[PDB]
């Protein structure tokens, strides 16, 4: 007769009245168990996530009558959940979400003797976080999961994270990120709206780092060795115009083709990035090599023939300048 | 006294309040003071000509039938479950192109009724609004995307929409967009539609958008300039190196062609010419004209012998006049292009 | 005097009105006058053969059972909730391919009843209709996408659809589209499907769509002409600069190949030959023919026996004016056959 | 007359009719003649192996309980709301993979009851049915995609599905398709699935699909043929022109590899070898072998100067034999390829 | 009549409760549930997920629903009354999205036998998720699983168990792009341990293998051909400077454009794959060939004939050195990734 006791308990109960209506504000503890961390879509600035949301509070009106015992916990139907009072909790930065119904309405409700209520439910929320794609290949991103009240001020409703385990992610294996620990703190990040008073809000921050192995091996090394090949034309004889012009021009063509093909594979945003700076610098170095050959040719065409001196200058000018630029680039972007 | 019971008494079967009739029926029009709060502005696309927003749309009006003084509480909240029993304006977006509410753990709708009868109604919406875009000057365009709030069945003499006196539209915190920057100042036009049936109230807020010239100005522009300078390098070579000059010219042509080909993947799918296609075409034409002038000078030089060295002198003269003629022409084109597309 | 109660007394349980019986039952057919108002035309895809629209579909008809005389006001608006309990024509789009209503802050429906029984029923729909596409001449095609309004469970002797006298199909302000420009003229054709069960009423409107000749022209045609002229430049050099001639020819053919390859993504994914592919194939054939001509010249010249050199010079002289004239003939045939 | 009241009298609380009991209960099975009408056949994809259709599925069966004789009108149209409470066959699609109804301005359902109990039930459905596809011979494949209709809760002794004698499956007017041509002939094979519980009725229709060849033919095959012919041309140049021949060979191989890259970009993503990959690989092998044979010729020639003129004659003989071996071998390969992939 | 016999057996007039598990406060109610993969595919590396269609059915004894008066052996039911009977709260631990099928009828079935055994078969479409590791991309073997678990019952109330035979079955010869589903599929027995007790768990593992024909041809073959072309560049006289420079730089360009065109088809991942190593090594070999030509050209020119002799010896020693290095690399690359 577990239905009769809960029915009689909910008789003469108002779902629209929070516990301690004129008393102290109610305390709610929030727990989150992330199942899967969805893939970040850098085009529209969002990331899906599937979580187990567990919020617990106290309700004096739901005190278990002494005549009925049952057990230390009592269960109300996930179809009769609407009879009792539930906090108005919503995610501030989310933009699309839904519940889950695979075989049943997967909402868990427990009512204990002392009056505590345990609520567990599934969600797949597509939160949003602004991503800074500057220093793109080796950046670091932070995304929030701000939970916030909607209808009650701090004088009526308050959210505090569970002391032990706020978030318990276990295995994600992101395609372009990785994380094991995240800042469970910043829970008391409270948002205030003027003319409505303080509004409770709890925030958790996930720190996302990007692996750079593919970009290091897929772009940086080929581009560097292309620049080396561009240098390589300095050692060929000046008279071999038909052999030194193709080397430089095809090095420039290879750089341009690689840049154009790598375009539309990188995120499509319009502002400078570390990879763009590297590519344009390498293209400029190839261009400078070709211009140096042009200067050698115009000097070449008893004449002193002061072109081998230009080649001697270049042989130590180009690698040194490239190494200096590389040192500056890594020191400033890493 | 339970506020739920008090509200049931105020509006219900034994109350006489009708939720299907506007306040001040057959009287003065009811004014609505509505202000929006943009929360997530982004997802701008050019294939479907639309963008997505999240709005904390809150609209205030006065209902004289809601006046009450017996209850001592200054504010009287209403549960979102029973929103069907109270009259609400039928505000709709003329260019919503689709939208939905949010129902995470609770309906994201709020309604509280003041003592004097003022009503607050704040809801959370997700509109994929649509705005036409002009890409005649693509890398330096200034889009103007708007949203319109209108009544559906009520004329001008029944329902009137007016923006709040201060802070009618409030953007959120430092959210960023890909390929766009939202201007911090946005005007509030006082729209109006005059149909045959009468006047329907309409209010619009225009968002000015500014494109970034960054990744664009680097990748789509600097390599083309470098290729043109390489073509001028080909100019600065002796006429005897015919294979070298031919190879340098045709390769520069190939490089410009492959740059133009690869650049199209990132560019929007648009049929009418943009401001970057002109630049690419002019660069390709410059490189082609370089190769053409090399062909001309080679043919003139070969006419000698194949009648004295006057032909060689003429070929040298062609080179001398081209070396300084073509860079100045390119500079003139560059100045005209940047002036016409920036001033 | 309590319009809700008056409407309940007019139609409802106590009035005997039935929501499943058409007006003028077992008698003359009831006419319906519906005028469409396009609000957003766009999202035209050549892959799934569909396009999306917004419609302020308002349809009018006369119901004698709804006529009233005691109420003073001429019109009487109706909430959608009670609109769900009144007879409405089952107008369904013959090629809807999917659609949904709009329910933002209120149901986007409107129903008012006049004194004489005339009722206006304006709703908001977001259709993604389907229209076949003819891309035989891709860059210079004129598509014709249509929508059809038909009844579902009624024949021509019960329900008859017809447009308004003027302004049946209307468009909004100067909305724009990518890769198309909507024609200002849209004829209101008449249709009727003679199924085996009877004659079902039908009305359709045709939207003419013309493709713009902008970006396509410049960045698909101009480089081809430039490469062919570069091949003629290769023609304009002697037969002893063999590395120069070979390099110029092979680089021109590679440039044409990469120009064809790069545009493959931009063009729609179709498997029948289009006008653009003919142009690209002809340009590639021209470049190949130029390279083959140079190969023949080199073979003859490497083949006193100076008459062979004289014959190579004759071949070069002939090809100097042969290729430009052939290209001009092709360019005058192509545009005439595809534009006129 | 009030057909709604007559319908309530015939079936409802005061009639004894049950909506969960099949007609002819505890007796012969009830045949359901169902015929479809394809209205939109498109959106065929290789990534997810499915296609979308729109069907005016109409099915008929006899119900002696619903049979009536007092009412004068032969047909009684019934609205969907009351259709929710009438017995219908438990039909479902064995490979639906997702589907939904259409409810634009009205439910797209039509039920009419004849005098002798015959019931007609036509609805509009949209299905993303799935069909396995093989791309072993991609450009010249013939594909067959089918749809299956089965009972879900009734065995062979209760529900039986049978196509109509004439025009069971029809198609609309001249609808087109990208990359495919729907065959006008479509056989209707019979089906039966013997599960552990018993025998379930099942019927399927096969839609034969051909693939277009013009665009693939031109864009992929023709440039490969031209590049192979250029690689052949690389034989006719003089032996001493080492830069010319090296450049021609390597540029032809670069052209072949960039054509292959473009194809792979524009081809369906499938991990098993198609019929165009063989062609591209063979063309690449041919141009590579031409460059290899030129290298062999150059090596033979070089050792003559570093034997007298014997090696030069050997190199000339190699050129002469290659100039006729390459075209004949390529023709043999082409003949074998087209014979094996067409016959 | 069977229609109201269900009401007589359970409901308002019988007293049966639809929110209490059978054998209340007693032994757990075992549920022998077996699935039937109807359509497997839509595997994507962008979101680490796959989609299935399942004819999930499950049996469990129910003495409350057990009946003996009705002569009929079986007793079917419709979803309308099925919505008022106790069912196990079975949810997938990695569903990532789900929905039923409701075409022309709800795709659900429920029949009750005399002894009380209940059958409950539903058709579901699950977009399950599995982490896929692409360290060795062309020669990987994935392992994607589904986890059926209870939600509001411990192991003292509800216990799941696979069928004794034929628990997981597959449909006819459905074909996937880029994957071949192995016929063998083990059925592990998971069990989650939480602070509130033990929750039931059962999993089925679908081993997946990737075909490598198209990848092999269209990536490995051109790279090997370009390496052979670089060796051809080795096999030329030293004085042919334009020819050798052109050949080397054009081979470098060909390798670069081959890699660039290959980056589009491959999955977009941030860690190094087994094909990126191969492409990088081939490109490095072409670069090394060009560097060797540069060295021999610098030595040969420079300047008696010993310097030119030294250049000839460099060509002689690098003519066969590179093939051996490439063979060694090929044997160490294929052994480490295939064995
Ligand atoms: C609220 C009300 O009933 N009275 C309004 C008045 O405030 C307003 O100035 C006028 C024009 O908007 O319409 C009337
Ligand atoms: C409501 C009404 O008048 N409908 C008319 C009908 O009476 C007439 O028979 C038919 C043919 O002209 O056109 C329509
Ligand atoms: C959090 O800050 C608020 C004040 O804005 C208040 O509740 C308290 O000082 C802090 N701690 C908790 C647990 O709320
Ligand atoms: C068809 O159905 C009737 C009952 O309606 C049954 O008597 C007959 O045997 C069935 N025949 C077929 C074609 O299965
Ligand atoms: C189910 O298994 C339990 C043991 O876990 C056993 O006690 C019980 O008798 C079995 N039968 C049922 C369905 O209760
Ligand atoms: C957003 C800061 C940009 C700083 C300048 C970057 C210049 C990069 C190009 C240098 C040649
Ligand atoms: C030419 C030197 C390249 C290496 C520079 C390393 C800089 C320090 C990096 C610290 C993470
Ligand atoms: C390709 C760039 C050429 C720049 C000018 C070079 C001039 C060199 C001669 C100075 C006396
Ligand atoms: C497009 C470049 C034109 C250069 C000048 C050509 C002159 C040719 C005639 C010389 C008498
Ligand atoms: C297709 C490659 C051919 C290589 C040269 C073969 C020469 C064989 C004859 C040696 C006397
Ligand atoms: C893969 C390069 C092959 C070069 C030619 C080798 C010839 C060897 C035989 C010489 C008699
Ligand atoms: C498959 C290409 C075959 C090219 C011709 C090879 C000839 C080898 C024998 C030369 C004497
Ligand atoms: C690729 C760079 C080569 C630099 C010159 C190396 C010279 C080595 C020989 C010194 C006697
Ligand atoms: C990367 C190839 C290196 C080949 C050996 C070069 C040796 C140069 C020094 C010779 C004395
Ligand atoms: C039974 C598996 C065989 C894998 C391929 C082995 C290749 C070994 C030779 C590599 C040069
Ligand atoms: C394994 C695919 C076989 C295709 C037909 C035969 C091709 C022969 C090419 C020489
Ligand atoms: C563009 C680079 C020029 C380098 C000149 C070096 C001169 C050394 C004497
Ligand atoms: C003779 C050695 C000259 C080195 C010049 C280095 C210049 C670095 C910017
Ligand atoms: C872009 C036109 C060519 C530059 C003008 C001078 C050409 C030589 C007379
Ligand atoms: C387009 C190629 C023409 C080849 C003509 C050859 C004439 C030989 C006498
Ligand atoms: C329907 C095919 C027409 C092909 C026309 C080719 C014209 C070539 C000049
Ligand atoms: C030489 C091509 C002429 C094309 C004329 C087209 C005219 C269209 C009205
Ligand atoms: C079905 C293939 C037709 C190919 C026509 C080619 C025309 C070239 C001028
Ligand atoms: C050059 C070989 C052509 C082979 C054509 C075969 C056509 C079969 C229908
Ligand atoms: C592809 C194998 C080539 C082997 C060349 C050996 C040369 C020995 C002098
Ligand atoms: C790789 C750089 C070599 C420099 C040599 C300077 C003498
Ligand atoms: C807005 C200023 C533009 C200057 C351009 C100088 C070429
Ligand atoms: C004859 C020299 C062989 C060198 C092999 C290096 C791996
Ligand atoms: C995991 C590292 C593999 C290196 C292979 C080198 C051939
Ligand atoms: C992280 C791997 C780097 C490899 C460089 C060759
Ligand atoms: C580019 C520098 C040239 C210096 C000539 C003396
Ligand atoms: C190619 C140019 C020729 C000019 C003859 C006057
Ligand atoms: C395109 C120029 C042709 C000139 C023929 C004499
Ligand atoms: C069928 C496999 C062919 C491979 C050709 C290199
Ligand atoms: C001498 C002719 C050989 C042909 C080989 C296919
Ligand atoms: C299926 C194996 C193909 C191998 C081609 C070289
Ligand atoms: Cl490319
Ligand atoms: Cl070259």
In degrees, rounded to 5, the angle at the alpha carbon of residue D274 between the alpha carbons of residues D271 and D280 is 110
Q: Rounded to an integer, what distance in angstroms lies between the CA atom of residue E33 and that of residue E166?
A: 11
Other C-beta atoms closer than 10 Å to the C-beta of D263 total 22
3-state secondary structure chain E: CHHHHHHHHCCCCCCCCCCCCCCCCCCCEEEEEEEEECCCEEEECCCCEEEEEEEEEEEECCCCCCCCCCCCCCCEECHHHHCCCCCCCEEECCCCCEECCCCCCCCEEEEECCCCCEEEEEEEEECCECCCCCCCCCCCEEEEEEEEEECCCCCCCEEEECCCCCCEEECCCCCCCCCEECCCCCCCCCEEEECCEEEEEEEEEEEEECCCHHHHHHHHHHHHHHHHHHHHHHCCCCCCHHHHHHHHHHHHHHHHHHHHHHHHHCCCCCCCCHHHHHHHHHHHHHHHHHHHHHHHHHHHCCCCCHHHHHHHHHHHHHHHHHHHHHHHHHHHHHHHHHC
What is the per-residue DSSP string for D210-266? E---HHHIIIIIHHHHHHHHHHHHTTTS-TT-HHHHHHHHHHHHHHHHHHHHHHHHH
Collapsing DSSP to helix, strand or coil, C302 comes out as helix
Evaluate the CA torsion angle B194, B195, B196, B201 in order and state its sign: negative
Instruction: Point out the residue among B178, B214, B238 whose CB comes nearest to the CB of A43.
Output: B178
Q: What φ, ψ does residue D61 adopt, rounded to 5°?
A: -160, 165
Q: Rounded to an integer, what distance in angstroms lies between the CA atom of residue D322 and that of residue E53?
A: 58
Instruction: Point out the residue among C93, C250, C262 whose CB comes nearest to the CB of D251.
Output: C250
| CA proximity to E261, closest of E285, E279, E274 | E279
Distance D226 CA to ligand 20 centre (A): 17
Give the chain C residue nearest B57 (alpha carbons): C105
Q: Rounded to an integer, what distance in angstroms lies between the CA atom of residue A172 and that of residue B270?
A: 39
Pairs of CB atoms within 8 A across C/D: 167
The answer to whether B265 contacts chain C (CB < 8 Å) is yes
| CA proximity to A96, closest of D61, C312, D328, B99 | B99
Give the chain D residue nearest C285 (alpha carbons): D226
Report the length, in residues, of chain A: 334
Q: Which site among B219, B250, B284, B290 would you substitute to test the A interface, given the most A Cβ atoms closer than 10 Å to its Cβ?
A: B219
The answer to whether B241 contacts chain C (CB < 8 Å) is no
Please give the distance of CA C277 from its chain centroid, rounded to a whole number. Answer: 21
Other C-beta atoms closer than 10 Å to the C-beta of E265 total 15
For chain B, give the longest Cα–Cα distance: 118
Tell me whether residue D252 is annotated as binding.
no
Collapsing DSSP to helix, strand or coil, A143 comes out as strand
Binary contact (B270, C179; C-beta < 8 A)? yes
| CA proximity to A149, closest of A97, A202, A185 | A202
In terms of domains, do E73 and E161 share one? yes
In terms of domains, do E180 and E285 share one? no
Kind and range of the H or E element at D162?
Answer: strand D159-162
Tokens 């008073």 belong to: A197
> Is E284 touching ligand 14 by the criterion CB < 6 Å?
no
Tokens of C40: 């957003």
For A56-80, letters b (16+ CB in 10 Å) and e give bbebebbebeeeeeeeeebbbebee
Q: How far is CA E37 from CA E52, E170, E185, E211, in A?
A: 7, 5, 12, 21
Q: Rounded to an integer, what distance in angstroms lies between the CA atom of residue D150 and that of residue A272?
A: 59
> CB within 8 A of D76, min separation 6: which ones?
D3, D6, D7, D112, D113
Burial class of residue E158 (count of CB atoms within 10 Å of its CB; 0-12, 13-18, 19+): buried
Instruction: Point out the residue among C49, C257, C273 whose CB comes nearest to the CB of D176.
Output: C49
- Which residue's alpha carbon is at the smallest distance from atom 6 of ligand 10? D296
**How far is C255 from chain B, CA to nearest CA, in Å?**
6
Pocket of ligand 15 (CB under 6 A): E 330-331, 334, 338
Distance C85 CA to ligand 33 centre (A): 80
In terms of domains, do B241 and B319 share one? yes
In terms of domains, do C202 and C220 share one? no
Q: Rounded to an integer, what distance in angstroms lies between the CA atom of residue E230 and that of residue E208?
A: 38
Collapsing DSSP to helix, strand or coil, C267 comes out as coil
Tokens of A126: 């597509």
In terms of domains, do A18 and A143 share one? yes
- Which residue's alpha carbon is at the smallest distance from atom 7 of ligand 23? C278
Residues 64-103 of E with CB under 8 A from D: 76, 78, 101, 103
Confirm if E169 and E154 have CB atoms less than 8 A apart.
Answer: no
Tokens of A258: 């690689």
Please give the distance of CA B328 from its chain centroid, rounded to a whole number. Answer: 37
Tokens of C10: 């007019």
Tokens of C134: 């003819």
| CA proximity to E180, closest of E138, E137, E211 | E211
**How far is B200 from chain A, CA to nearest CA, in Å?**
31
Pocket of ligand 24 (CB under 6 A): D 334-335, 338, 342
Instruction: Point out the residue among D46, D57, D127 whose CB comes nearest to the CB of E177.
Output: D46
In terms of domains, do B108 and B225 share one? no
Computed on alpha carbons and rounded to an integer, the radius of gyration of chain C in Å comes to: 33
Domain boundary among A154, A179, A209: A209
In terms of domains, do A188 and A232 share one? no
Binary contact (C153, D77; C-beta < 8 A)? yes
Resolution in Å, one decimal place: 3.5
Computed on alpha carbons and rounded to an integer, the radius of gyration of chain E in Å comes to: 33
Pairs of CB atoms within 8 A across A/B: 165
- Which residue's alpha carbon is at the smallest distance from atom 1 of ligand 24? D335
- Which residue's alpha carbon is at the smallest distance from atom 6 of ligand 13? E295
Confirm if C295 and C312 have CB atoms less than 8 A apart.
Answer: no
> Is C335 touching ligand 21 by the criterion CB < 6 Å?
no
Q: Rounded to an integer, what distance in angstroms lies between the CA atom of residue B51 and that of residue D274?
A: 41
In terms of domains, do D225 and D196 share one? no
Give the chain D residue nearest E81 (alpha carbons): D20
Q: B25 contacts in C (CB within 8 Å)?
A: none
- Total domains in chain D come to 2
In terms of domains, do A204 and A233 share one? no
The answer to whether D46 contacts chain E (CB < 8 Å) is yes
Give the chain D residue nearest C86 (alpha carbons): D106
Pairing of strands A147-153, A197-202: antiparallel
Q: Rounded to an integer, what distance in angstroms lies between the CA atom of residue B334 and that of residue D49?
A: 51
Q: What φ, ψ does residue C258 adopt, rounded to 5°?
A: -70, -30
> CB within 8 A of A237, min separation 6: which ones?
E241, E301
Q: Rounded to an integer, what distance in angstroms lies between the CA atom of residue B282 and that of residue B221?
A: 12
> CB within 8 A of A60, min separation 6: which ones?
A19, A20, A115
Q: Rounded to an integer, what distance in angstroms lies between the CA atom of residue E99 and that of residue A198?
A: 40
Pairing of strands C30-37, C169-170: parallel
Q: Rounded to an integer, what distance in angstroms lies between the CA atom of residue E123 and that of residue E103?
A: 11
Q: Any idea what the CATH number is for the domain that residue A14 is in? A: 2.70.170.10
Helical residues (DSSP H) of chain A, grouped into ranges:
2-10, 213-215, 221-232, 241-262, 274-300, 308-333
The ligand whose atoms approach the alpha carbon of A323 most closely is 7
The ligand whose atoms approach the alpha carbon of C272 most closely is 23
| CA proximity to B123, closest of B166, B163, B92, B155 | B92
- Which residue's alpha carbon is at the smallest distance from atom 3 of ligand 28? E321
Tokens 């110029």 belong to: C248
Confirm if B23 and B87 have CB atoms less than 8 A apart.
Answer: yes
In terms of domains, do C203 and C292 share one? no
> CB within 8 A of D82, min separation 6: which ones?
D4, D7
Collapsing DSSP to helix, strand or coil, A300 comes out as helix
Confirm if A103 and A97 have CB atoms less than 8 A apart.
Answer: no
Q: C127 contacts in D (CB within 8 Å)?
A: 104
In terms of domains, do B181 and B285 share one? no
Distance E255 CA to ligand 25 centre (A): 22
Please give the distance of CA A159 from its chain centroid, rounded to a whole number. Answer: 24
Domain boundary among D164, D194, D210: D210
Give the chain D residue nearest C290 (alpha carbons): D230
Tokens 């000339």 belong to: D316
Q: Which site among B218, B243, B254 would you substitute to test the A interface, given the most A Cβ atoms closer than 10 Å to its Cβ?
A: B218
Q: Rounded to an integer, what distance in angstroms lies between the CA atom of residue C260 and that of residue B338?
A: 31
Confirm if B251 and A253 have CB atoms less than 8 A apart.
Answer: yes
The answer to whether C237 contacts chain D (CB < 8 Å) is no
Tokens 């650049």 belong to: B263
Instruction: Point out the residue among E105, E225, E236 whose CB comes nearest to the CB of D288.
Output: E225
Q: Rounded to an integer, what distance in angstroms lies between the CA atom of residue A205 and that of residue A42?
A: 18
The ligand whose atoms approach the alpha carbon of E214 most closely is 36
Distance D74 CA to ligand 37 centre (A): 70
Tokens 């075992």 belong to: E30
Q: Rounded to an integer, what distance in angstroms lies between the CA atom of residue A102 and that of residue D266?
A: 38
Q: Rounded to an integer, what distance in angstroms lies between the CA atom of residue E270 and that of residue A175?
A: 6
In terms of domains, do A225 and A170 share one? no
- Which residue's alpha carbon is at the smallest distance from atom 2 of ligand 8? B233
Binary contact (D254, E257; C-beta < 8 A)? yes
For A268-279, letters b (16+ CB in 10 Å) and e give ebbbbbbbbebb
Torsion of CA A76, A82, A85, A91, to 10 degrees: 110
| CA proximity to B101, closest of A97, A50, C125 | A97
- Which residue's alpha carbon is at the smallest distance from atom 1 of ligand 10? D293
**Which subunits have 3 or more CB–CB pairs within 8 Å of chain A?**
B, E
3-state secondary structure chain B: CCHHHHHHHHCCCCCCCCCCCCCCCCCCCEEEEEEEEECCCEEEECCCCEEEEEECCEEEEECHHHCCCCCCCCEEECCHHHHHHCCCCCEEECCCCCEEECCCCCCCEEEEEECCCEEEEEECEEECCECCCCCCCCCCCCCEEEEEEEECCCCCCCEEEEECCCCCEECCCCCCECCEEECCCCCCCCCEEEECCEEEEEEEEEEEEECCCHHHHHHHHHHHHHHHHHHHHHHCCCCCCHHHHHHHHHHHHHHHHHHHHHHHHHCCCCCCCCCCHHHHHHHHHHHHHHHHHHHHHHHHHHHCCCCCCHHHHHHHHHHHHHHHHHHHHHHHHHHHHHHHHHC
Q: Rounded to an integer, what distance in angstroms lies between the CA atom of residue B246 and that of residue C238?
A: 13
| CA proximity to C257, closest of D222, D215, D258, B252 | D258
Helical residues (DSSP H) of chain D, grouped into ranges:
3-10, 80-83, 214-216, 222-233, 242-266, 277-305, 310-340
Tell me whether residue B150 is annotated as binding.
no
Confirm if C172 and C156 have CB atoms less than 8 A apart.
Answer: no
Q: Domain of residue A80: give its range.
A: 2-209
Strands (E), chain C: 30-37, 42-45, 50-55, 58-62, 77-78, 92-93, 99-100, 109-113, 118-123, 125-130, 142-150, 159-162, 169-170, 181-182, 190-195, 198-210
Kind and range of the H or E element at D58?
Answer: strand D50-62
Domain boundary among D148, D181, D210: D210
Q: Rounded to an integer, what distance in angstroms lies between the CA atom of residue B272 and that of residue B274?
A: 6
Q: Rounded to an integer, what distance in angstroms lies between the CA atom of residue A152 and that of residue D262?
A: 59
In terms of domains, do A36 and A128 share one? yes
Q: Any idea what the CATH number is for the domain that residue E239 is in? A: 1.20.58.390
Binary contact (E260, A212; C-beta < 8 A)? no
Task: Give binding residues of E as ranges.
Answer: 57, 121, 184, 186, 194-199, 207
Q: Rounded to an integer, what distance in angstroms lies between the CA atom of residue D57 and that of residue D96?
A: 14
In terms of domains, do B124 and B171 share one? yes
In terms of domains, do E203 and E279 share one? no
Residue A82 per-residue DSSP state: G
Instruction: Point out the residue among B110, B244, B266 whose CB comes nearest to the CB of A150.
Output: B110
Strand partners, D151: D91
The ligand whose atoms approach the alpha carbon of D225 most closely is 24
Pairs of CB atoms within 8 A across D/E: 164
Tokens of E10: 């359970």
Confirm if E257 and A261 have CB atoms less than 8 A apart.
Answer: yes
Confirm if A70 and A4 have CB atoms less than 8 A apart.
Answer: no
Q: What φ, ψ does residue B209 adopt, rounded to 5°?
A: -120, 145
Pairing of strands D91-93, D30-45: unpaired
Pairing of strands D30-45, D169-170: parallel
Pairing of strands D76-78, D30-45: unpaired
In terms of domains, do C192 and C241 share one? no
In terms of domains, do A175 and A251 share one? no
Q: Rounded to an integer, what distance in angstroms lies between the CA atom of residue C6 and that of residue A106?
A: 46
Collapsing DSSP to helix, strand or coil, D270 comes out as coil
Q: Any idea what the CATH number is for the domain that residue B66 is in? A: 2.70.170.10
Tokens of C319: 């090809």
Residue A65 per-residue DSSP state: P
> Is E288 touching ligand 14 by the criterion CB < 6 Å?
yes
Q: Which atom of ligand 7 is nearest to the CA of A323?
A: 1
Confirm if E47 and E129 have CB atoms less than 8 A apart.
Answer: yes
Please give the distance of CA B214 from its chain centroid, rounded to a whole number. Answer: 17
Domain boundary among B172, B187, B210: B210
> Is D296 touching ligand 10 by the criterion CB < 6 Å?
yes
Burial class of residue D106 (count of CB atoms within 10 Å of its CB; 0-12, 13-18, 19+): middle
Report the length, in residues, of chain D: 343
Tokens 């309604």 belong to: B111
Kind and range of the H or E element at D124?
Answer: strand D118-127
| CA proximity to D16, closest of D66, D81, D70, D91 | D66
In terms of domains, do D271 and D164 share one? no
Distance C69 CA to ligand 37 centre (A): 77
What is the per-residue DSSP string for A196-222? TEEEEEE--EEEEE---HHHIIIIIHH
Tokens of C259: 């120009």
Tokens of C244: 């120069």
Q: Rounded to an integer, what distance in angstroms lies between the CA atom of residue E255 and that of residue E261?
A: 10
Tokens of C270: 């179709």
In degrees, rounded to 5, the angle at the alpha carbon of residue C172 between the alpha carbons of residues C170 and C175 is 130
Q: Domain of residue E271: give its range.
A: 213-338
In terms of domains, do A83 and A205 share one? yes
| CA proximity to D162, closest of D192, D118, D206 | D192
Q: Which site among E1, E39, E167 would you substitute to test the D interface, given the most D Cβ atoms closer than 10 Å to its Cβ?
A: E39
């Amino acid at each position: 007769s577990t239905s009769n006791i809960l029915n009689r308990l909910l008789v003469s109960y108002d779902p629209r009245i929070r516990p301690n209506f004129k008393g102290i504000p109610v305390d709610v503890v929030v727990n989150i168990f992330i199942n899967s961390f969805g893939s970040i879509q850098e085009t529209t600035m969002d990331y899906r996530v599937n979580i187990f949301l567990r919020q617990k509070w106290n309700d004096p009106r739901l005190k278990l009558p002494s005549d009925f015992r049952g057990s230390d916990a009592l269960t109300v139907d996930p179809t009769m959940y609407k009879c009792l009072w539930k906090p108005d909790l919503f995610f501030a930065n989310e933009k699309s979400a839904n519940f889950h119904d695979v075989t049943q309405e997967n909402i868990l409700l427990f009512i204990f003797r002392d009056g505590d209520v345990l609520v567990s439910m599934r969600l797949s929320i597509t939160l949003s976080c602004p991503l800074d794609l500057t220093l793109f290949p080796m950046d670091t991103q932070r995304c929030k999961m701000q939970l916030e009240s909607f209808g009650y001020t701090t004088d009526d409703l308050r959210f505090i994270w569970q002391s032990g385990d706020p978030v318990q992610l276990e295995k994600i294996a992101l395609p372009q990120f990785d994380i094991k620990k995240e800042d469970i703190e910043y829970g008391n990040c409270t948002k205030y709206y003027k003319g409505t008073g303080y509004y409770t809000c709890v925030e958790v921050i996930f720190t996302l780092r990007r692996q750079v192995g593919f970009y290091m091996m897929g772009v940086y090394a080929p581009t560097l060795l292309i620049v080396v090949l561009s240098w390589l034309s300095f050692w060929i004889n000046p008279d071999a115009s038909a052999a030194r012009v193709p080397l430089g021009i095809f090095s420039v063509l290879s750089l341009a083709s690689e840049c154009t093909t790598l375009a539309a594979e990188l995120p499509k945003v319009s502002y400078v990035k570390a990879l763009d700076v590297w590519l344009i610098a390498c293209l400029l170095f190839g261009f400078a090599s070709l211009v140096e050959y042009a200067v050698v040719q115009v000097m070449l065409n008893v004449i002193p023939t002061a072109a081998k001196r230009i080649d001697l200058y270049a042989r130590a000018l180009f690698p040194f300048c490239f190494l200096f630029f590389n040192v500056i680039y890594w020191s400033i972007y890493l | 006294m339970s506020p739920s019971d008090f509200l049931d008494k105020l509006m219900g079967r034994t109350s006489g309040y009708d939720a299907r009739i506007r306040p001040n029926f057959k009287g003065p029009p009811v004014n609505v003071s509505c202000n929006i709060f943009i929360n997530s502005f982004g997802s701008i696309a050019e294939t479907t000509m639309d963008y997505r927003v999240n709005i904390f749309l809150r609209q205030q009006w006065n209902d004289p039938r809601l006046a009450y003084n017996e209850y001592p509480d200054d504010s009287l909240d209403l549960d979102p479950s029973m929103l069907d029993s109270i009259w609400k304006p039928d505000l709709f977006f003329a260019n919503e192109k689709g939208a939905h509410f949010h129902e995470i753990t609770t309906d994201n709708k709020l309604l509280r009724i003041s003592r004097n009868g003022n009503v607050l109604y704040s809801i959370r919406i997700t509109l994929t609004l649509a705005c036409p875009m002009d890409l005649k000057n693509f890398p330096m365009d200034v889009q103007t995307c708007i949203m319109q709030l209108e009544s559906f069945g009520y004329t001008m003499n029944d329902l009137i929409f007016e923006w709040q006196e201060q802070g009618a539209v409030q953007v959120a915190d430092g959210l960023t967009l890909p390929q766009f920057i939202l201007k911090e100042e946005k005007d509030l036009r006082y729209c109006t539609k005059h149909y045959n049936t009468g006047k329907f109230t309409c209010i619009e807020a225009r968002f000015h958008l500014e494109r970034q010239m960054g990744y664009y100005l680097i990748q789509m522009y600097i390599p083309s300039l470098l290729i043109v300078i390489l073509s001028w390098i080909s100019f600065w070579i002796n006429m005897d190196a015919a294979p070298a000059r031919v190879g340098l010219g045709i390769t520069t042509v190939l490089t410009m062609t492959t740059q133009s080909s690869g650049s199209r993947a990132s560019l929007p799918k648009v049929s009418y010419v943009k401001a970057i296609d002109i630049w690419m075409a002019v660069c390709l034409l410059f490189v082609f004209s370089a190769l053409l002038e090399y062909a001309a000078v080679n043919f003139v030089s070969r006419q000698h012998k194949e009648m004295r060295k006057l032909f060689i002198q003429r070929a040298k003269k062609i080179d001398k006049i081209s070396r300084i003629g073509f860079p100045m022409a390119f500079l003139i084109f560059n100045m005209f292009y940047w002036i016409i597309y920036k001033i």
